[PDB]
Amino acid sequence: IYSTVNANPYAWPYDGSIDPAHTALILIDWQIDFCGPGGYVDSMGYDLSLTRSGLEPTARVLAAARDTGMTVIHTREGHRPDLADLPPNKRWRSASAGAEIGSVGPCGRILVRGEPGWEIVPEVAPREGEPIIDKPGKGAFYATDLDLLLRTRGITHLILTGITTDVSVHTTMREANDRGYECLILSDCTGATDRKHHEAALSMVTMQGGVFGATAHSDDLLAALG
Amino acid sequence: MIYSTVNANPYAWPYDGSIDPAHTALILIDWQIDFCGPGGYVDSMGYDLSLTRSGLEPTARVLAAARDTGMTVIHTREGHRPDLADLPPNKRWRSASAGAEIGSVGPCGRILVRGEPGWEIVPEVAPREGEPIIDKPGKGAFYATDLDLLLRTRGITHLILTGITTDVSVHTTMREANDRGYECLILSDCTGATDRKHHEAALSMVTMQGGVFGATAHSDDLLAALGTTV
Amino acid sequence: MIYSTVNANPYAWPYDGSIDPAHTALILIDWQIDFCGPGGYVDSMGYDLSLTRSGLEPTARVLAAARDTGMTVIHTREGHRPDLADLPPNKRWRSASAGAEIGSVGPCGRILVRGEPGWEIVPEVAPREGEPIIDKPGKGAFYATDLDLLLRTRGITHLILTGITTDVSVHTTMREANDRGYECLILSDCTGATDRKHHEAALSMVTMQGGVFGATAHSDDLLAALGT
Amino acid sequence: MIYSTVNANPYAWPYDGSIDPAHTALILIDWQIDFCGPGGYVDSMGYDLSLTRSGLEPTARVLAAARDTGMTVIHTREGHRPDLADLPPNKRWRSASAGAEIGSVGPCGRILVRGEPGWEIVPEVAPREGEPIIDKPGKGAFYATDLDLLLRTRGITHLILTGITTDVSVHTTMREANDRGYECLILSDCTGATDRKHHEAALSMVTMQGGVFGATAHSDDLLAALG
């Protein structure tokens, strides 16, 4: 059992200790489509250095979670190759931005399950015993079995890493928080298409006594786990 | 009977090129004393009520336009069962830390408890018969409610969002609806937050990647479209 | 106090070998005039109310035992918003075809509408403060409600089911809970149906494949385990 | 291109008076060796496979008719992630009690595990590209899946149900769909159960209260309505 994390705006978690038997690290969408050359985000013309800066810090947190025996869950955003799970508005916006879901680029069909751009990057590769969530939306709970995996393991606390801070990570945090999960978001293990959106996404969590949970740097988590 | 697109950011809304009132709902989120009035939850935490109240008059004019065109209208209230059976202990603990514990007695009764004066919808945007009210225990209006059943029964595909706050309840509801494939518009002058920088960032987040959560617009741009049949 | 297993079909319930009141809820499903009283929905369709009412007094004895042991108690009411925004058109059409249209005026007010006399919980099993009531628009108590939030907030893992009808609202709620991993017991003498053969078949369906939906028991065997 | 009602119990189905293939899906539930073939889960528990297999050839004729009319077709497989992360401990314990533990090795590989021979859809009703397959960890096809997203994206309002077993996976899926407002038909000769009395009672339960869960029909009456 571990102590609290020095976090914003309260010492996390609210109940005063971290139990690996009730805590999961979530790694959200570390895929070429969100952080690598030739994928979805690169094809739209965004700066990949903003999404990639969280990769090596995430690998150090993943190693700490594995050493403490906490649950580890990974997510991949993606669609059935027949696109039966693709809403027409999501498709139309991706075409408007110059990177249509299902269209072929340097890393295969954009955001399609089984394609090279959709795979988890090797810097944070999963291992046996770490379930992978395949989500068709931004939030990892909707149209998945994530809540069943968490409730079966008795998980009450989540530590969030991955990309992007303001889209998939924030949506997943908001979904978990409404169900009563106690959530921490790591500031140096997340990133966005705009630095001001990354910073605003983190400061939004801290209002009203910690409306969505708390924020911390990975250094503050690693100090609590040591 | 069908209306043109809205001049919106970052695309002319909606994506399918017209607004049909038979398939469109206006959502009014949490226009309650607890979020925008003296003596409630937000006031007791020490935030500036002028930031949350400025969207009330514009919302009333959009509500009038929705009623005139025969759109669906749905209202939401955040709040808890008086026995607090729907209150997660972390939500309760943070509200106490912020100096406004849910269920504690203040100037407007028990904070965020269903049936209390602070929890009522303010009269400037009072519901009418035929405009369902959602009682939500969380920030998103879909979780632990019948909202998705009400929308699917009426054949709703498109949502127009107003209410408070931009970055918490409104954004959570927009993200939930968007993942299910609803086409959503958020009105910039009919929403507000505890911090102006968070209000502005919440709107600009919508506009990335071709409109990742939908589009943004001023109520003037919506009212112009609702005076232009095609 | 922690209690031993219940003599149940097809295994001594529950699977994990003890009953902890801190993690167990008694659910009372739809004990309303619309399902078990004169002038309501079920009476207006022409079904025999003695089939649905026989479980009322046994349910009151189990409710007393649940309150004595400090277990969670949750009640359900099936019903609709007065504006009928939560009423699917197929559910409405079938209720009209059966001679008891939802929302139509009958001897106990508008049929299956929230706030109407026929919709109230009957006094034999009146709720107490601290026993949450679920308002469900469907047969299953989880769909379009906050039930799963109430159960997870209290740390509930085990459910004991009573109420009506065995084959419709009770079975649908049991199937929904079971898929989420809740461990469920259905009481044979505290439930009932519009047809006795459907009541008996609904109970036997639970018992297949090692207890596919949980187990069945008589209230006497639950009260024996609780030492009442 | 729009079809008339099916002669069904207890009303001519559907309630709105016609069948539009653009808004209708045929669901094939759990036609797997684990539920209907030698060496699988149901066989290892000692139940009579002739009761679950009798609906296979009628189902194949209905699948051919659905393909000809351009209806949506959706298939389901019950089963678990190979790491068993989606397996509740009560489900596991009961399967061991019944002598067929989920994840244990039997004649067709690991019982109810995704990717194993006993878990595959049997060839008589093999899926085709553009007929989505649901992998469900529970009895109801909606819980912990993307089924509701697939149906709402296609504009589906009406469901025709086939598969096994009548009283477990088929009934649970019918009850879940009905509460959301889907209009459902269950085919009596394209379903089956571990007990014939449970099959018959599961069909009769649908028919009460003016059709509380929908209606029942024979394949013959559906194929007559489709022409």
Residue numbers in the entry:
A (entry chain A): 2 to 227
B (entry chain D): 1 to 230
C (entry chain C): 1 to 228
D (entry chain B): 1 to 227
Text lifted from the article:
TrtA is a member of the isochorismatase-like hydrolase (IHL) protein family, similarly to BiuH, and has a catalytic efficiency (kcat/KM) of 6 x 105 M−1s−1, a KM for triuret of 20 μM, and exquisite substrate specificity. TrtA and BiuH are members of the IHL protein family that possess the catalytic triad comprised of a cysteine, aspartate, and lysine residue. Interestingly, the active sites of TrtA and BiuH are almost identical in sequence, and so it was hypothesized that triuret is the substrate for TrtA, funneling into biuret metabolism.
Mel, which is colocated with a cyanuric acid hydrolase (AtzD) and has no triuret hydrolase in the genome. However, despite our efforts, triuret was not bound to the active site, possibly due to low affinity for the substrate. The promiscuous activity of RhdBiuH on both triuret and biuret sparks curiosity as observed structural differences between RhdBiuH and BiuH in the active site are minimal despite the differences in substrate specificity between the two enzymes. Arguably, protein dynamics, which are not captured by crystallography, may play a role in these specificity differences that could pertain to the catalytic mechanism and substrate tunneling/product release by the enzyme.
